[PDB]
Design an enzyme around this catalytic site. Structure first.
Site, PDB file in Angstrom:
ATOM      1  N   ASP A 294      -0.095   6.507   8.200  1.00 31.49           N
ATOM      2  CA  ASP A 294      -0.373   6.248   6.792  1.00 31.49           C
ATOM      3  C   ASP A 294      -1.724   5.577   6.660  1.00 31.49           C
ATOM      4  O   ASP A 294      -1.914   4.460   7.152  1.00 31.49           O
ATOM      5  CB  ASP A 294       0.686   5.351   6.167  1.00 31.49           C
TER       6      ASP A 294
ATOM      7  N   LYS B 189      -4.984   8.424   0.626  1.00 30.39           N
ATOM      8  CA  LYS B 189      -4.764   8.018  -0.755  1.00 30.39           C
ATOM      9  C   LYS B 189      -6.096   7.957  -1.492  1.00 30.39           C
ATOM     10  O   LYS B 189      -7.106   7.475  -0.947  1.00 30.39           O
ATOM     11  CB  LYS B 189      -4.073   6.645  -0.825  1.00 30.39           C
TER      12      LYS B 189
ATOM     13  N   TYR C 291      -8.647   1.081   2.898  1.00 31.15           N
ATOM     14  CA  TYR C 291      -8.326   0.210   4.033  1.00 31.15           C
ATOM     15  C   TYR C 291      -9.537  -0.038   4.937  1.00 31.15           C
ATOM     16  O   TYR C 291      -9.472  -0.912   5.804  1.00 31.15           O
ATOM     17  CB  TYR C 291      -7.154   0.759   4.847  1.00 31.15           C
TER      18      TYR C 291
ATOM     19  N   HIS D  27      -3.228   6.441  -5.339  1.00 28.82           N
ATOM     20  CA  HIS D  27      -2.881   5.169  -4.690  1.00 28.82           C
ATOM     21  C   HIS D  27      -2.190   4.182  -5.661  1.00 28.82           C
ATOM     22  O   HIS D  27      -1.172   3.584  -5.310  1.00 28.82           O
ATOM     23  CB  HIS D  27      -4.152   4.581  -4.067  1.00 28.82           C
TER      24      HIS D  27
HETATM   25  N1  LIG Z   1       0.563   2.407  -1.260  1.00 31.99           N
HETATM   26  C1  LIG Z   1       0.312   1.115  -1.259  1.00 31.99           C
HETATM   27  O1  LIG Z   1      -0.143   0.491  -2.360  1.00 31.99           O
HETATM   28  C2  LIG Z   1       0.547   0.275  -0.060  1.00 31.99           C
HETATM   29  C3  LIG Z   1       0.647  -1.113  -0.165  1.00 31.99           C
HETATM   30  C4  LIG Z   1       1.001  -1.845   0.968  1.00 31.99           C
HETATM   31  C5  LIG Z   1       1.215  -1.197   2.178  1.00 31.99           C
HETATM   32  N2  LIG Z   1       1.052   0.163   2.263  1.00 31.99           N
HETATM   33  C6  LIG Z   1       1.247   0.896   3.538  1.00 31.99           C
HETATM   34  O2  LIG Z   1       2.438   0.445   4.172  1.00 31.99           O
HETATM   35  C7  LIG Z   1       2.106  -0.118   5.439  1.00 31.99           C
HETATM   36  C8  LIG Z   1       3.135  -1.179   5.815  1.00 31.99           C
HETATM   37  O3  LIG Z   1       3.102  -2.272   4.919  1.00 31.99           O
HETATM   38  P1  LIG Z   1       2.392  -3.652   5.312  1.00 31.99           P
HETATM   39  O4  LIG Z   1       1.261  -3.377   6.259  1.00 31.99           O
HETATM   40  O5  LIG Z   1       2.171  -4.357   4.022  1.00 31.99           O
HETATM   41  O6  LIG Z   1       3.510  -4.514   6.081  1.00 31.99           O
HETATM   42  P2  LIG Z   1       4.786  -4.329   7.054  1.00 31.99           P
HETATM   43  O7  LIG Z   1       4.657  -3.048   7.768  1.00 31.99           O
HETATM   44  O8  LIG Z   1       5.979  -4.630   6.234  1.00 31.99           O
HETATM   45  O9  LIG Z   1       4.534  -5.575   7.998  1.00 31.99           O
HETATM   46  C9  LIG Z   1       3.405  -5.639   8.854  1.00 31.99           C
HETATM   47  C10 LIG Z   1       3.368  -7.021   9.469  1.00 31.99           C
HETATM   48  O10 LIG Z   1       4.491  -7.200  10.337  1.00 31.99           O
HETATM   49  C11 LIG Z   1       4.051  -7.516  11.655  1.00 31.99           C
HETATM   50  N3  LIG Z   1       4.952  -6.816  12.574  1.00 31.99           N
HETATM   51  C12 LIG Z   1       4.975  -5.479  12.825  1.00 31.99           C
HETATM   52  N4  LIG Z   1       5.992  -5.179  13.650  1.00 31.99           N
HETATM   53  C13 LIG Z   1       6.657  -6.337  13.883  1.00 31.99           C
HETATM   54  C14 LIG Z   1       7.779  -6.638  14.646  1.00 31.99           C
HETATM   55  N5  LIG Z   1       8.421  -5.720  15.343  1.00 31.99           N
HETATM   56  N6  LIG Z   1       8.177  -7.942  14.681  1.00 31.99           N
HETATM   57  C15 LIG Z   1       7.536  -8.922  13.991  1.00 31.99           C
HETATM   58  N7  LIG Z   1       6.438  -8.654  13.227  1.00 31.99           N
HETATM   59  C16 LIG Z   1       6.026  -7.360  13.203  1.00 31.99           C
HETATM   60  C17 LIG Z   1       2.597  -7.075  11.722  1.00 31.99           C
HETATM   61  O11 LIG Z   1       1.845  -7.839  12.659  1.00 31.99           O
HETATM   62  P3  LIG Z   1       1.069  -7.109  13.862  1.00 31.99           P
HETATM   63  O12 LIG Z   1       0.121  -6.117  13.266  1.00 31.99           O
HETATM   64  O13 LIG Z   1       0.349  -8.236  14.508  1.00 31.99           O
HETATM   65  O14 LIG Z   1       2.136  -6.463  14.754  1.00 31.99           O
HETATM   66  C18 LIG Z   1       2.123  -7.313  10.299  1.00 31.99           C
HETATM   67  O15 LIG Z   1       1.761  -8.660  10.109  1.00 31.99           O
HETATM   68  C19 LIG Z   1       0.671  -0.586   5.279  1.00 31.99           C
HETATM   69  O16 LIG Z   1       0.039  -0.882   6.516  1.00 31.99           O
HETATM   70  C20 LIG Z   1       0.113   0.613   4.534  1.00 31.99           C
HETATM   71  O17 LIG Z   1      -0.073   1.692   5.460  1.00 31.99           O
HETATM   72  C21 LIG Z   1       0.746   0.891   1.153  1.00 31.99           C
END
Ligand SMILES: NC(=O)c1ccc[n+]([C@@H]2O[C@H](COP(=O)([O-])OP(=O)(O)OC[C@H]3O[C@@H](n4cnc5c(N)ncnc54)[C@H](OP(=O)(O)O)[C@@H]3O)[C@@H](O)[C@H]2O)c1
Length: 312
Positions: A44, A78, A49, A111
């Site tokens: 994704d 996006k 980003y 997005h």
């Molecule tokens: N469309 C949109 O508006 C939008 C908005 C937000 C997000 N997104 C997409 O969704 C993705 C995921 O959401 P997100 O990045 O907000 O957060 P998330 O995936 O819910 O959480 C990521 C966080 O969790 C940590 N982590 C990952 N695996 C872990 C595990 N097994 N145990 C403990 N901690 C862990 C990561 O640290 P480390 O990296 O250090 O492992 C990072 O700090 C984004 O990266 C993006 O691609 C889209």
């Protein structure tokens, strides 16, 4: 097992994707390489980003080195809020394609349901513009028609905004990518999406614990942790498997090799039905409010409530 979902185009969408928001240019390449080596087949991405070039460089290497073929990977990007004008839409995708070193994306998303003026790195409310989703969607439909985007969809659309688009669109959105995790279950929107043949894809499935301006409470939830302890899985694994069993894809982000692996091992076990029922009592609150698009005087959305059409 829940390894994929079928989109309304017929395409198979792998159910676990690697998220790349807040993956630095220096770390994202090795993360993508590790993920694809582990077995991820879905990445994704987004222009905003700031890391698509570095992703593209690694994708080129993975293809060249015969780790994976292009046809077996699912790449999402996006359209950012600066590029909603129909003239700007195909240019925006072409920049993403150049950076990612691809000829097509598998999914291209609006997005957020908002327009912003070009020319600030920072977002300021002065730069918010009137929105015209039907016009932008018609430009997305042209990208679908030409094969530049094999599927098109939306992100951060409330039930009402998705319904309004579906009523008039020629090509229905394939995906609505939204915040979804045990503390923000999105059952209303998911039900609507299902009825219309739109797939719901969960961003921040772990509650985005690395984002400093959000509370880090999702993976600390006591119900979630009891299930984790009983099943011998990590809290993140439970959150991810929960999402899959709820019928949506999940987009966990990590730049750490161990965690990337841990997060993908969500297919060889399940949360039993009675334990699964316990999640239904977890307290609900939306983490990602979209406040950057909300302003009392300068925005189409005067409040968070308006942005989400009351889904708060
Ligand atoms: N469309 C949109 O508006 C939008 C908005 C937000 C997000 N997104 C997409 O969704 C993705 C995921 O959401 P997100 O990045 O907000 O957060 P998330 O995936 O819910 O959480 C990521 C966080 O969790 C940590 N982590 C990952 N695996 C872990 C595990 N097994 N145990 C403990 N901690 C862990 C990561 O640290 P480390 O990296 O250090 O492992 C990072 O700090 C984004 O990266 C993006 O691609 C889209």
């Amino acid at each position: 097992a829940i390894t994929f979902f079928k989109l309304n185009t017929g395409a198979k969408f792998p159910s676990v994707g690697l998220g790349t928001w807040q993956a630095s240019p220096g770390l994202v390449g090795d993360a993508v390489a590790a993920a694809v080596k582990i077995g991820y087949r879905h990445i994704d991405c987004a222009q905003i980003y700031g890391n698509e070039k570095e992703i593209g460089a690694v994708l080129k290497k993975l293809f060249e080195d015969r780790v994976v073929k292009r046809e077996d990977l699912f790449i999402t990007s996006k359209l950012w809020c600066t590029d909603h004008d129909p003239q700007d839409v195909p240019e925006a995708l072409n920049r993403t394609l150049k950076d990612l070193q691809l000829e097509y994306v598998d999914l291209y998303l609006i997005h957020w349901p908002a327009r912003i003026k070009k020319g600030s790195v920072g977002i300021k409310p002065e730069n918010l513009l009137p929105v015209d989703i039907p016009s932008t969607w018609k430009a997305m439909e042209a990208l679908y028609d030409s094969g530049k985007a094999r599927a098109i969809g939306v992100s951060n659309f409330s039930t009402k905004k998705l319904a309004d688009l579906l009523e008039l669109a020629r090509v229905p959105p394939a995906v609505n990518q939204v915040e979804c995790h045990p503390s923000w279950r999105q059952t209303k929107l998911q039900e609507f999406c299902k009825s219309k043949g739109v797939h719901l894809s969960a961003y921040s499935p772990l509650g985005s614990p690395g984002t400093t301006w959000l509370k880090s409470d999702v993976l600390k939830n006591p119900i979630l942790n009891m299930v984790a302890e009983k099943l011998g899985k990590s809290p993140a694994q439970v959150a991810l498997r929960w999402g899959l069993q709820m019928g949506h894809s999940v987009l966990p982000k990590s730049t750490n090799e161990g965690r990337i692996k841990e997060n993908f091992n969500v297919f060889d076990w399940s949360i039993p039905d009675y334990m699964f029922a316990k999640f239904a009592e977890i307290e609900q609150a939306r983490l990602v409010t979209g406040s950057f698009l909300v302003h009392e005087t300068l925005s189409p959305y005067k409040s968070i409530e308006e942005l989400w059409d009351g889904e708060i």
